[PDB]
């Protein structure tokens, strides 16, 4: 309906959740994916090292 105080509370909840994601969700999962990518891509290292 109209401008409230609710805006500030939503800003606080927003930043809370942004931190709670930043630290304890995002690197935790991108590390997982890219560690799997290391172990997948480095399998080629055989056909590029022993083959040679």
């Amino acid at each position: 309906m109209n401008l409230n105080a609710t805006i500030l509370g939503q800003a606080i909840a927003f930043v809370l959740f942004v931190l709670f994601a930043m630290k304890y969700v995002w690197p935790p999962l991108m590390a997982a994916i890219e560690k799997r990518q290391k172990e997948i891509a480095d399998g080629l290292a055989s056909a590029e090292r022993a083959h040679k």
């Binding site: 055989s46 056909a47 022993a50 083959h51």
Partner: protein
Amino acid sequence: DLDLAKASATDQLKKAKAEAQVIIEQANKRRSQILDEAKAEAEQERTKIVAQ
């Protein structure tokens, strides 16, 4: 595939090294036998010519 390829890579030195050894160990006997048989001929010829 790393194990299967590095097996050959780690073995063929041993093998071809042994065969490079073998070739020379034959050639050596060849030299020794010729230095023997030239002695046999050295006696045989001189004996022939004295009989002559």
